[PDB]
Swiss-Prot record, chain A:
PROSITE patterns linked: FG_GAP (PS51470), INTEGRIN_ALPHA (PS00242)
Binding residues annotated for Ca(2+) 2, in chain numbering: 282, 284, 286, 288, 290
Ranges: FG-GAP repeats: 1-66, 77-138, 141-193, 205-259, 260-325, 326-383, 387-450
Location (main, coarse): membrane
GO cellular component: alphav-beta3 integrin-HMGB1 complex; alphav-beta3 integrin-IGF-1-IGF1R complex; alphav-beta3 integrin-PKCalpha complex; cell surface; cytosol; external side of plasma membrane; extracellular exosome; filopodium membrane
UniProt protein name: Integrin alpha-V
S-S bridge residues: 57-65, 106-126, 140-153, 459-470, 476-533, 593-599, 665-678, 818-849, 839-844
Subcellular location: Cell membrane; Cell junction, Focal adhesion
GO aspect biological process, one term: cell-substrate adhesion
Swiss-Prot record, chain B:
Cellular component GO terms, alphabetical: alpha9-beta1 integrin-ADAM8 complex; alphav-beta3 integrin-HMGB1 complex; alphav-beta3 integrin-IGF-1-IGF1R complex; alphav-beta3 integrin-PKCalpha complex; alphav-beta3 integrin-vitronectin complex; apical plasma membrane; cell surface; cell-cell junction
Primary localisation category: membrane
Name of the protein in question: Integrin beta-3
Residues annotated for Mg(2+) binding in this entry: 121, 123, 220
Domain VWFA, residue spans: 109-351
Gene that encodes it: ITGB3
Function: Integrin alpha-V/beta-3 (ITGAV:ITGB3) is a receptor for cytotactin, fibronectin, laminin, matrix metalloproteinase-2, osteopontin, osteomodulin, prothrombin, thrombospondin, vitronectin and von Willebrand factor. Integrin alpha-IIb/beta-3 (ITGA2B:ITGB3) is a receptor for fibronectin, fibrinogen, plasminogen, prothrombin, thrombospondin and vitronectin. Integrins alpha-IIb/beta-3 and alpha-V/beta-3 recognize the sequence R-G-D in a wide array of ligands. Integrin alpha-IIb/beta-3 recognizes the sequence H-H-L-G-G-G-A-K-Q-A-G-D-V in fibrinogen gamma chain.
Lineage: Eukaryota, Metazoa, Chordata, Craniata, Vertebrata
Family: Belongs to the integrin beta chain family.
Record annotation: effect of changing residue 196 to P: In GT2; variant form
Gene Ontology molecular function terms on file: cell adhesion molecule binding; coreceptor activity; enzyme binding; extracellular matrix binding; fibrinogen binding; fibronectin binding; identical protein binding; integrin binding
PSI domain boundaries: 4-50
Organism of provenance: Homo sapiens (Human)
Annotated segments matching region CX3CL1-binding: 267-287
Amino acid sequence: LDVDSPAEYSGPEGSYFGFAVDFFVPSASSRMFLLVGAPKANTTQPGIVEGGQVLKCDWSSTRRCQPIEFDATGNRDYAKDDPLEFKSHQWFGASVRSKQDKILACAPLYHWRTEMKQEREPVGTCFLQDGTKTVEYAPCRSQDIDADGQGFCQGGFSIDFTKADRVLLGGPGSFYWQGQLISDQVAEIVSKYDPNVYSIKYNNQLATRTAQAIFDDSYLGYSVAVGDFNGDGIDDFVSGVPRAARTLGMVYIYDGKNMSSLYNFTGEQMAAYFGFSVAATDINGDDYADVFIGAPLFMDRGSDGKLQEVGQVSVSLQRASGDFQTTKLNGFEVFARFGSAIAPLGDLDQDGFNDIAIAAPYGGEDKKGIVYIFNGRSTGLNAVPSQILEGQWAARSMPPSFGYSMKGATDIDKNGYPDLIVGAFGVDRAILYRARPVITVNAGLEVYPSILNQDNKTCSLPGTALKVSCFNVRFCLKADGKGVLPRKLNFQVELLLDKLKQKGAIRRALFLYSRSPSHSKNMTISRGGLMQCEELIAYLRESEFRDKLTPITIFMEYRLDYRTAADTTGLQPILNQFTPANISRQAHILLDCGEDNVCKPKLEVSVDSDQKKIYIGDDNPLTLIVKAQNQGEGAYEAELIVSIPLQADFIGVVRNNEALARLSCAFKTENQTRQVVCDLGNPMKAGTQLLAGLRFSVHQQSEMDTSKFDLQIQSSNLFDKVSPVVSHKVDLAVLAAVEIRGVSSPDHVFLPIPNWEHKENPETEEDVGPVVQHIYELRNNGPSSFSKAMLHLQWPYKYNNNTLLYILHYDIDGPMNCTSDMEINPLRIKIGDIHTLGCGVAQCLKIVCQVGRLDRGKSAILYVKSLLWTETFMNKENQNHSYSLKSSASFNVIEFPYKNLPIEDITNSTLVTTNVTWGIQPAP
Amino acid sequence: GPNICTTRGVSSCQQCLAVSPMCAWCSDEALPLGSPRCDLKENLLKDNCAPESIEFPVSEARVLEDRPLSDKGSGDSSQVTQVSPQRIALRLRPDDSKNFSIQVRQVEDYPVDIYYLMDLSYSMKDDLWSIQNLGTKLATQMRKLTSNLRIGFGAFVDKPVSPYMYISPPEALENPCYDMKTTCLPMFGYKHVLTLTDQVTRFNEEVKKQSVSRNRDAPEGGFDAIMQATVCDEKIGWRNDASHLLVFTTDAKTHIALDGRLAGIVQPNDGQCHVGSDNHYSASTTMDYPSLGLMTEKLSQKNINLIFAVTENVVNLYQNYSELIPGTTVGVLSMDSSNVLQLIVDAYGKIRSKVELEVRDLPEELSLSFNATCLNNEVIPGLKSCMGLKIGDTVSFSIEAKVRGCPQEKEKSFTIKPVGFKDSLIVQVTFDCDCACQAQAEPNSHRCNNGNGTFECGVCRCGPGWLGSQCECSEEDYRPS
Ligand SMILES: CC(C)[C@H]1C(=O)N[C@@H](CCCNC(=N)N)C(=O)NCC(=O)N[C@H](CC(=O)O)C(=O)N[C@H](Cc2ccccc2)C(=O)N1C
């Protein structure tokens, strides 16, 4: 249904123009018109105000609307100054029905001066216009006066034309508003007309009769329709009775030959107004009329369980046995009054099944009205609406009521598809929607080599001698369509060589010529069986991509060139609703495991480090010597991922030994981790094992860390792509190589010293003798550090009751604290063969030193300064004797910063010697 | 060794008392040297400070006045008391507070509004007496169940248009009973007669001063009247707190939405107040009847309870209608009205209250924490509400006060008021942050070290170069002795 440029008509403001609409298709002439009711338009009839009008509108010929000269007579006089009828404010045009040349309009609110007594009574009336003759028709203007008879019949409230030129008319007010149906032959209506007679009687009239008082205020005749429900070939009458059965509502079907009741439908909810609008039409192509009944005010359980007013439509399919099959449709909004108007459309799309429009005139945004189109299918109506038309005029002083009246099933433009007319009497408008031709397009795409091989590199790449693999893609388009359509349609086709690959990551296929993953072409097609086809040759990139498992998807989409496919009036065609706008198909590529296209891996990992012990310091980079293997059908895009400790940092693969693979690798910190990612073949050859030679910095910068790497091998395989987790744990060794050494200066001395004299109470350095200085060094020449250690140093003090080396002082480098067990500088002195002398035979002095932190390779020193006691050697006990004084130093470590790690008690010692000789020996 | 009374470098009574309630200053000069004058309260009383040399101020709340919460509904000396206590005093130590309880008990009778809708169709001529008797007895009954009853009424016949109206004879417009040669009032759509008022006698007289009219079709336009009585607030006089009842009387079927198309009325009911200054439904002839959905929606929107008071022969019909309008009851209208009065008695029995506290005159310097002990002794900290209260039901709220430091004003007040209830609890608030000892201040006079300071609480606030316990020492002077 065209919805962008429909035909809009307007009547005089406040005229209700559009209350009732219909088509006019004269048999004599060829042009078609629209008939629209204006039940409040102001007419030129003498003395009549708001008499109502029926307007004929020209459609394409400038869309002019002009009134029909139905009646130019004001009130008639039953006597001088005694009016007979009250045409003013009659709702003439409240119901318009046209069949060939017969136009029938009705005024339900026409009161006439009862012939027996001066009195108003709305008997209603109608006008029937043939080619040129025009007559007035009013069954209820009879001698059955008053409400108890046909006084308030209000005939013409609803009307319809029977297939065999019988007019059916519904008076909802007859017999105390019980209602009534009157069916009369048009020929008898025109033949019996007599202007001087007001109660004309027709011989072949079919009418219902008065019933008991229990049926009062039932409103039979509120709406009418025609359809055959007993198979006699003569259309039967269907009427809605919205107030029957304690207000439940009902629908009566009366035989169209003797007016005998056939079927009764009953509602289920009070006051739902089940029967406001009825429609008979076959909705499943079974040739049996089906009944649609509207209940605009039906209330149903809401989301919260509370009743909400949405309306309802009951669809009763007829069956041969006489039963009925009833389903129901519910409205999609609250207070929208869905089901107010039901309009058969005929085959709106030529799908073979009749389609129906249902109006919710107070739905949509701003309550501007809405209309839903339901397409008929075999076995019932498609409960899901296919199209939704929305009102476009805002309320001036009254709801627009768009969709309050509808009429379809007439091809006004002669394009082979029926059109629709909708009334917006709230804004006094009428809108014609033209149905568009429905083109059904069958598109067939096929890739002959569904599975493609790189090895089939038999195709010459244009522009270069290089070779590629060429595969075929075929695409065919056939566009069928009923009705007036252009003989030729310019379709546009677009093909994508690789769907998915989101964000344009990579596309592995390109057309042989003008390499590009997309290609579009305009191909003409003529409506017919010629399945016009075209082919393209596309080639894949050897190692330009890293994903050879996910299938390559070919995608095709076609767009009809609507612009040039329209008619001369500018009505563009449409494509079928259910046909998919795109067709996609799957290609494939395989490596190894040919028979098992679904290729299954079986991965396995192992790890065993060579130097599984570390010294907690500067050492060779740690290498795991990882083993990776597979025994499955393969391993695609295999990669080894190793998570390393924070103390380990990635190092390049080992090139010293060629047995290890020449594997490129990289590092990342995804998700706050420490990952080393290397490749293991894409794919692994029969799962053949590989040997890793990667290294790591294993930089241990936290003494509290205890002793581990984890690792895995994964692949791009679609299943079983994760290998078992394999972890290794190296150990930490405390290689704190502590060494103690020393030196003495001078290394030798000659006695007696030059310019020296014996002194009994020396007070300065010169008085005692030469200065002897000893340096001791403790160095932790190892990768492992210690936090606290114990240091010792023993010194020779006195030999033969005589001092050997008179200590002057001891100096601390700073990394240790020292304490002397014996008095230092007791007297407070101002600062042949050689025999060994030391603490073994001589009174000895020792100084105990506690050493603090000593890092990797760090060292500390201790200094001792002493004076050589010359008088000791000048004594008789040592005269002409040469000696070698000895001292020893020792260390012992006690506390390491690696508190968690094991601590080993390591100790050692060394010696420092000085030489003294008698320079002035006796003459030989 | 107090956590904050000495660690904060406390040296003044004012700040010693202002830092926290746990901190107090020992003032007497007789205190021997030792722990500071602001030791922990638990041990400061024994840490060389005599009992009379220290004060331990503590926040407290005093219930000066209280009253039993009017257990029974009889008259009181002045009026019933709904909330207790009546007034309390609260001396709050800086940054100190505690708990106090307030209990509420509904004793006042509920406010009720009744609107009576009378069908004045000709079919009711035999039922007019029953309508009048029911209208009188509604008040006579409810007045004995409550005291805030307001009553009113209106009437309806049908839309004044063809085919419903009697328009045919020129002189029948003023007497639709022209055919029977009797007189009946001209027919009308809907007219609001008497607003909701407490004058029961006026309502009785007006109801008994009514007469019937006549239209054509048996169904009536009562739904228009219901909708207008619902959506019109000022005209009807609905109260925002009273329980609203809308009694509706009829004896025949009812017109429903889309029945007006027969009369040329196709505009859907607007659902707006359309009663003009003449107390007539001015949109009767141009707007259709209202659908049941709209009626239910508007009844719910304004908390109006709808009761059908219908005759026997239609009761079932309207009974079924009640199923489509949840929250509505139906009763037989007859000479014996007890059956339909039981509906109103039950409806009144169904009334329930709400309790919500208020905070009116509090400043930003004070706050409360609420803990509600609602019905069934269910305790729930963190709210100020309670539902499902009958007459005589009781709830309580334990409230913990809180004050920031020492507010800038010594005296204040705040009133706690239950929602709707006129009664309230008034709380007077005072603060005693100032040091009582500081009343003996002596700036630069005798004591201290020849002046040069201000003796306040055993310590002299000495000037520059005079810092010390009694200004005997300077800021940067040390005694080698
Ligand atoms: C007969 C009498 C006992 C009774 C009655 O039955 N009225 C019906 C019967 C019509 C059915 N006839 C058919 N051939 N199908 C009727 O006409 N109803 C429509 C109406 O006119 N109702 C009005 C109320 C109104 O104005 O709102 C009103 O006049 N009802 C009268 C009231 C009455 C009762 C008893 C004596 C006199 C009048 C009514 O109930 N009937 C006429």
